[PDB]
Design a protein around this motif. Structure first.
Motif, PDB file in Angstrom:
ATOM      1  N   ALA A  85     -24.785  67.600 -36.619  1.00  0.00           N
ATOM      2  CA  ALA A  85     -25.256  66.986 -35.404  1.00  0.00           C
ATOM      3  C   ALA A  85     -24.392  67.429 -34.224  1.00  0.00           C
ATOM      4  N   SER A  86     -23.715  66.494 -33.562  1.00  0.00           N
ATOM      5  CA  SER A  86     -22.872  66.800 -32.435  1.00  0.00           C
ATOM      6  C   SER A  86     -22.159  65.531 -32.025  1.00  0.00           C
ATOM      7  N   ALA A  87     -21.162  65.673 -31.162  1.00  0.00           N
ATOM      8  CA  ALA A  87     -20.656  64.520 -30.463  1.00  0.00           C
ATOM      9  C   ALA A  87     -21.850  63.859 -29.731  1.00  0.00           C
ATOM     10  N   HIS A  88     -22.839  64.679 -29.367  1.00  0.00           N
ATOM     11  CA  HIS A  88     -24.023  64.220 -28.618  1.00  0.00           C
ATOM     12  C   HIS A  88     -25.026  63.478 -29.462  1.00  0.00           C
ATOM     13  N   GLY A  89     -24.706  63.272 -30.745  1.00  0.00           N
ATOM     14  CA  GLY A  89     -25.442  62.369 -31.621  1.00  0.00           C
ATOM     15  C   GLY A  89     -24.897  60.921 -31.522  1.00  0.00           C
ATOM     16  N   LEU A  90     -23.763  60.757 -30.830  1.00  0.00           N
ATOM     17  CA  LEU A  90     -23.048  59.448 -30.736  1.00  0.00           C
ATOM     18  C   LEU A  90     -22.873  59.005 -29.323  1.00  0.00           C
ATOM     19  N   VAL A  91     -22.676  59.976 -28.425  1.00  0.00           N
ATOM     20  CA  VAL A  91     -22.479  59.698 -27.014  1.00  0.00           C
ATOM     21  C   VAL A  91     -23.334  60.707 -26.229  1.00  0.00           C
ATOM     22  N   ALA A  92     -23.343  60.603 -24.919  1.00  0.00           N
ATOM     23  CA  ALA A  92     -24.239  61.436 -24.132  1.00  0.00           C
ATOM     24  C   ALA A  92     -23.526  62.240 -23.077  1.00  0.00           C
ATOM     25  N   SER A  93     -24.204  63.305 -22.612  1.00  0.00           N
ATOM     26  CA  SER A  93     -23.828  63.927 -21.328  1.00  0.00           C
ATOM     27  C   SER A  93     -25.073  64.068 -20.446  1.00  0.00           C
ATOM     28  N   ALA A  94     -24.878  64.014 -19.133  1.00  0.00           N
ATOM     29  CA  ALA A  94     -25.938  64.289 -18.158  1.00  0.00           C
ATOM     30  C   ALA A  94     -26.579  65.647 -18.438  1.00  0.00           C
ATOM     31  N   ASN A  95     -27.901  65.709 -18.268  1.00  0.00           N
ATOM     32  CA  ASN A  95     -28.680  66.967 -18.284  1.00  0.00           C
ATOM     33  C   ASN A  95     -28.987  67.507 -19.639  1.00  0.00           C
ATOM     34  N   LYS A  96     -28.681  66.738 -20.683  1.00  0.00           N
ATOM     35  CA  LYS A  96     -28.898  67.202 -22.032  1.00  0.00           C
ATOM     36  C   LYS A  96     -29.823  66.264 -22.844  1.00  0.00           C
ATOM     37  N   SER A  97     -30.839  65.679 -22.179  1.00  0.00           N
ATOM     38  CA  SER A  97     -31.663  64.644 -22.783  1.00  0.00           C
ATOM     39  C   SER A  97     -32.330  65.007 -24.096  1.00  0.00           C
ATOM     40  N   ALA A  98     -32.939  66.200 -24.171  1.00  0.00           N
ATOM     41  CA  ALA A  98     -33.655  66.480 -25.403  1.00  0.00           C
ATOM     42  C   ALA A  98     -32.662  66.662 -26.557  1.00  0.00           C
ATOM     43  N   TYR A  99     -31.526  67.274 -26.253  1.00  0.00           N
ATOM     44  CA  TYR A  99     -30.528  67.576 -27.275  1.00  0.00           C
ATOM     45  C   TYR A  99     -29.820  66.272 -27.741  1.00  0.00           C
ATOM     46  N   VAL A 100     -29.311  65.489 -26.789  1.00  0.00           N
ATOM     47  CA  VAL A 100     -28.729  64.146 -27.116  1.00  0.00           C
ATOM     48  C   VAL A 100     -29.734  63.309 -27.929  1.00  0.00           C
ATOM     49  N   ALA A 101     -31.005  63.225 -27.486  1.00  0.00           N
ATOM     50  CA  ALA A 101     -32.014  62.471 -28.259  1.00  0.00           C
ATOM     51  C   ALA A 101     -32.256  62.999 -29.669  1.00  0.00           C
ATOM     52  N   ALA A 102     -32.351  64.338 -29.815  1.00  0.00           N
ATOM     53  CA  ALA A 102     -32.567  64.911 -31.126  1.00  0.00           C
ATOM     54  C   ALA A 102     -31.364  64.586 -31.987  1.00  0.00           C
ATOM     55  N   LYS A 103     -30.172  64.792 -31.421  1.00  0.00           N
ATOM     56  CA  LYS A 103     -28.905  64.656 -32.197  1.00  0.00           C
ATOM     57  C   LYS A 103     -28.647  63.186 -32.586  1.00  0.00           C
ATOM     58  N   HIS A 104     -28.882  62.245 -31.663  1.00  0.00           N
ATOM     59  CA  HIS A 104     -28.959  60.803 -32.062  1.00  0.00           C
ATOM     60  C   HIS A 104     -29.996  60.563 -33.162  1.00  0.00           C
ATOM     61  N   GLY A 105     -31.187  61.184 -33.029  1.00  0.00           N
ATOM     62  CA  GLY A 105     -32.191  61.065 -34.066  1.00  0.00           C
ATOM     63  C   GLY A 105     -31.701  61.573 -35.430  1.00  0.00           C
ATOM     64  N   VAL A 106     -30.973  62.683 -35.452  1.00  0.00           N
ATOM     65  CA  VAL A 106     -30.399  63.212 -36.739  1.00  0.00           C
ATOM     66  C   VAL A 106     -29.409  62.211 -37.384  1.00  0.00           C
ATOM     67  N   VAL A 107     -28.515  61.684 -36.552  1.00  0.00           N
ATOM     68  CA  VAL A 107     -27.579  60.635 -37.011  1.00  0.00           C
ATOM     69  C   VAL A 107     -28.328  59.498 -37.651  1.00  0.00           C
ATOM     70  N   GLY A 108     -29.350  58.959 -36.955  1.00  0.00           N
ATOM     71  CA  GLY A 108     -30.192  57.937 -37.516  1.00  0.00           C
ATOM     72  C   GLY A 108     -30.930  58.382 -38.767  1.00  0.00           C
ATOM     73  N   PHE A 109     -31.517  59.569 -38.727  1.00  0.00           N
ATOM     74  CA  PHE A 109     -32.177  60.114 -39.932  1.00  0.00           C
ATOM     75  C   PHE A 109     -31.212  60.245 -41.137  1.00  0.00           C
ATOM     76  N   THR A 110     -29.991  60.691 -40.885  1.00  0.00           N
ATOM     77  CA  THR A 110     -28.937  60.785 -41.945  1.00  0.00           C
ATOM     78  C   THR A 110     -28.703  59.450 -42.629  1.00  0.00           C
ATOM     79  N   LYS A 111     -28.594  58.391 -41.833  1.00  0.00           N
ATOM     80  CA  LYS A 111     -28.420  57.057 -42.380  1.00  0.00           C
ATOM     81  C   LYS A 111     -29.557  56.640 -43.318  1.00  0.00           C
ATOM     82  N   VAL A 112     -30.811  56.860 -42.906  1.00  0.00           N
ATOM     83  CA  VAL A 112     -31.915  56.518 -43.776  1.00  0.00           C
ATOM     84  C   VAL A 112     -31.874  57.362 -45.056  1.00  0.00           C
ATOM     85  N   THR A 113     -31.578  58.662 -44.924  1.00  0.00           N
ATOM     86  CA  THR A 113     -31.549  59.551 -46.084  1.00  0.00           C
ATOM     87  C   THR A 113     -30.532  58.988 -47.055  1.00  0.00           C
TER      88      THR A 113
END
Ligand SMILES: NC(=O)c1ccc[n+]([C@@H]2O[C@H](COP(=O)([O-])OP(=O)(O)OC[C@H]3O[C@@H](n4cnc5c(N)ncnc54)[C@H](O)[C@@H]3O)[C@@H](O)[C@H]2O)c1
Ligand SMILES: NC(=O)c1ccc[n+]([C@@H]2O[C@H](COP(=O)([O-])OP(=O)(O)OC[C@H]3O[C@@H](n4cnc5c(N)ncnc54)[C@H](O)[C@@H]3O)[C@@H](O)[C@H]2O)c1
Ligand SMILES: NC(=O)c1ccc[n+]([C@@H]2O[C@H](COP(=O)([O-])OP(=O)(O)OC[C@H]3O[C@@H](n4cnc5c(N)ncnc54)[C@H](O)[C@@H]3O)[C@@H](O)[C@H]2O)c1
Ligand SMILES: NC(=O)c1ccc[n+]([C@@H]2O[C@H](COP(=O)([O-])OP(=O)(O)OC[C@H]3O[C@@H](n4cnc5c(N)ncnc54)[C@H](O)[C@@H]3O)[C@@H](O)[C@H]2O)c1
Ligand SMILES: [Mg+2]
Ligand SMILES: [Mg+2]
Lengths: 253, 255, 246, 260
Positions: free
Chosen positions: C141-169
């Motif tokens: 994932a990324s640090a961007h799976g846990l926290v955010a930076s400006a201008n990176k919405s699709a990437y932060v959202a995907a990477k948060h989604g992976v973190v969440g997906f990992t938990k379910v897996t």
């Protein structure tokens, strides 16, 4: 109060969204309702809110699977109402199955409505809010935007995505009079849930809650609406890029 | 509104605590004030809140570094006010030093007031709240209860400890008409911070420079905002908000 | 040591995925590389890794942006190696723009690669793992799976989604000898990043002022694949030089 | 490996700290042992590790409820061992009760050992590590440093404080060749947990293995205990060069406890 302000609430023809729209109306905001349902039942709700609260209430049935329909919902709110002060991204769907068994059509659909609709709605609203120098974006995520349950892969991924998207929104708007936050509810007693409840029922309700929600009490659309009112208020002007958990202790443990 | 309810706010003779006490009084709550300062000004504050809002306001000068004094503050509140609906554990102190340079006396002082006083106040309030079927415990933690900064080891440790302690309080009381949550503010523009902001450019230019490191909005949180946040957590809409943090931090924890 | 195990690493032709494949190769696992680039300069790699470490090293050029290609990669990796022990979901793309300026196509492309490819890989890998009674899903994932930076919405959202997906897996495989975890890297000096000023780039986000390296990430993957990490499931491991500590 | 390196492991006479001390000794590290129990058994452990792994092993029985004693443990480890490369702050105690019933003496004792010992130990270690340009600080927190359970107020507050303290430690030492991380275990079947199994066993008037599966079921989706060896392995990883840029973070070894 929110007199003179306009709030769009997605998926507000029933359930949580209707509870939020109703609370915002009661503070004096004009409202755009959205969602599916019976034409007559929806008109009753729309006319009823307008008459009870003395505000203008529009209904826009835009199908929020389609990003262009989402951005057009927002642009139509501005056309018909004059402005857009508050956007509540609420509409969502669920599908439970194991990852291996999880239909790609359902994965895709859940992401499209539960996540991408937030993006499209938010993209459409921001230019207006920035020009105004005022905005509130309130995304309705879930406890599942913070933690996971087995068999809810797409929904958990989408809600988590909504949380991270909410934080970016906030950082891109910081100090411009705009905040973005995610409300993360635990269990709310909707008819869908009500089915699952059916040795008596308030022994069944307690048992269904006991796995995830320590208070053994449901969250209500009214409470979520008061939480949206609070986030829309001046007291919340420096609350941004965060989550408000309304979950009976679900995330405490 | 909160007419008929009783709120005790620790550290309410100035700053954030006084902002919270004021907001609560304005919703009709009777108030117990607490903290130090000039006693004439404190009485002016106490009398004036009571007159402006038409509520009963007491002052209790308990030294909250002492466990039995925190417990007596809560028990005196119930004795004099008849009940305790809202406890806001707000009083706090700070010290900055590298860990290896951090005086043990300061470590212990910060833990005793910023963390242990929340334990002592909560322990005394809970039996009363459980008997009432109603309570709201509102702990004023910090962004530093969720994340860290260098040189603030004791404050960060204690505020983290407050966040965890808040969660346990919520889990012991879940379903009993009582919630416990922690408000986590970023920078608020107190006299102290003002002194740093005082310390070559314009005042409001230095303010933004100082906020710059941690608070994306470049705007300070205010005692009034934090008071309205406490009012909301005390309201019936927040009946299922328990064991959580509400960050009032201008984007600090989003990044 | 991972002898007799098979690893699939998506995006392993360059940067961190290669870093990870190499580290995993050096422990005796057979490797399936994947990714884009010169068909021959990749053969150098597929060959030079297999010779260097005495393991089988395949290459599959599958475009992961397509859901059926991901599931094929997995099923073909099983057919060509006999099994799958470790799935590493690493392939990923970026795009920087204000949310209101963000092209929908870039949005959808980031979500399809960075997030849905992870769902697709895992769905394909899981039945084999549950029958094996052994598996390691490691999502990068990324640090961007846990926290955010400006201008990176699709990437932060995907990477948060992976973190969440990992938990379910993790939750769906609990106790079945499979774990799923997410490595959340901070800054790594890739080609793209490389293009001193190197301390000042890190300065905003990464308190150590030192880059993370693919070998480090490789070491981290090797750890999560180990027996010591048997009860490490459903979690994130931040390798970010202090990024998320503040 | 850690040949030539010195690790101090608090509370290493039993359970988790013993598993961590063993794994580090197995990597070539000299070891200072610490903690209580039977002295003949402790000596058997210390001599056993030294002989088996060919490293130097000392026992310092410092009572880490006193901050001076904690700093003294570290100081004398440097005196007697030559250096300190790894500090594993692991000793801890538990007491369960409702907040309003929780003895002030137990609140104080759990804060003193489970939180303030981490501060005192780190404060004594850091000047040496900074001088060396190398260090690993590994704090043994818990799943309870990240989430709560009812009736564990002092323990959850202290563990949360350790998590925050670990972060500050990381920030103060960033870039200096020193990392500070907190391992956050779920249930490990040590005597700290046995007392709890027994208390659940008696409550529901059930056997001991009913209580074990049910104890696990409430919190730990894997339904398997975490082991000291696994935690030792995790500590060895954090001490490695692969973990050089892992700093100020938590590593949960909890069978899914914090995923839900
Ligand atoms: N109910 C719960 O226990 C619970 C818990 C946590 C979070 N949530 C979230 O809160 C939100 C509200 O859902 P709810 O529980 O009230 O469900 P609901 O079915 O009662 O209402 C959902 C609304 O969304 C609308 N909708 C669905 N698809 C749409 C589409 N494509 N275009 C436009 N509108 C559409 C519906 O018409 C309806 O008005 C969802 O995001 C949900 O995931 C619900
Ligand atoms: N000011 C900020 O930027 C900021 C940010 C986040 C959190 N906080 C927290 O808010 C809380 C209050 O802070 P503030 O900034 O308003 O500080 P302040 O100094 O203005 O007020 C603190 C209050 O605590 C009282 N107090 C101090 N020691 C006491 C003791 N021994 N016994 C009884 N009362 C005592 C003081 O008299 C005062 O009324 C603290 O916990 C602080 O950590 C402050
Ligand atoms: N580099 C950093 O500073 C950084 C930081 C945190 C996380 N990450 C993450 O680590 C992962 C790897 O990134 P990297 O920096 O090594 O990038 P990279 O460019 O060095 O490598 C990316 C790999 O993915 C492959 N790829 C791209 N699109 C593909 C597709 N459609 N199908 C199959 N393969 C495809 C490329 O061929 C390449 O091998 C990404 O998920 C990224 O988000 C990178
Ligand atoms: N067992 C678990 O499920 C569990 C889970 C998460 C975290 N932890 C943490 O792991 C750590 C080790 O716990 P454990 O379960 O191995 O328990 P344990 O009882 O087996 O070990 C405790 C060790 O600390 C020592 N100790 C106790 N008081 C001391 C003092 N005053 N001074 C010096 N040493 C002292 C003991 O003698 C022993 O060596 C604790 O911090 C505990 O909180 C344990
Ligand atoms: Mg942060
Ligand atoms: Mg949890």
């Amino acid at each position: 109060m929110l007199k003179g302000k306009v709030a769009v609430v997605t998926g507000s023809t029933s359930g949580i969204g209707l509870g939020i729209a109703t609370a915002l109306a009661a503070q004096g905001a004009d409202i755009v309702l959205n969602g599916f349902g019976d034409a007559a039942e929806i008109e009753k709700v729309r006319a009823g809110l307008a008459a009870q609260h003395g505000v203008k209430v529009l209904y826009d049935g835009a199908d929020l699977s389609k990003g262009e329909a989402v951005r057009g919902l927002v642009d139509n709110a501005v056309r018909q109402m004059g402005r857009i002060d508050i956007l509540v991204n609420n509409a969502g769907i669920q599908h439970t199955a194991l990852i291996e068994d999880f239909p790609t059509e359902k994965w895709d659909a859940i992401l499209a409505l539960n996540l991408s609709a937030v993006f499209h709605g938010t993209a459409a609203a921001l230019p207006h809010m920035k020009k105004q120098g005022f905005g509130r974006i309130i995304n309705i995520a879930s406890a599942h935007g913070l933690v996971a349950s087995a068999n809810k892969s797409a929904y958990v991924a989408a809600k988590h995505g909504v949380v991270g998207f909410t934080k970016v929104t906030a950082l891109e708007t910081a100090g411009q009079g705009i905040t973005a936050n995610a409300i993360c509810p635990g269990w709310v007693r909707t008819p869908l849930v009500e089915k699952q409840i059916s040795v008596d029922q308030e022994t069944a309700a307690r048992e269904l809650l006991s796995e995830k929600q320590p208070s053994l009490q449901f969250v209500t659309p009214e409470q979520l609406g008061g939480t949206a009112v609070f986030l829309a208020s001046d007291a919340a002007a420096q609350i941004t890029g965060t989550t408000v958990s309304v979950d009976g202790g679900w995330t405490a443990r």
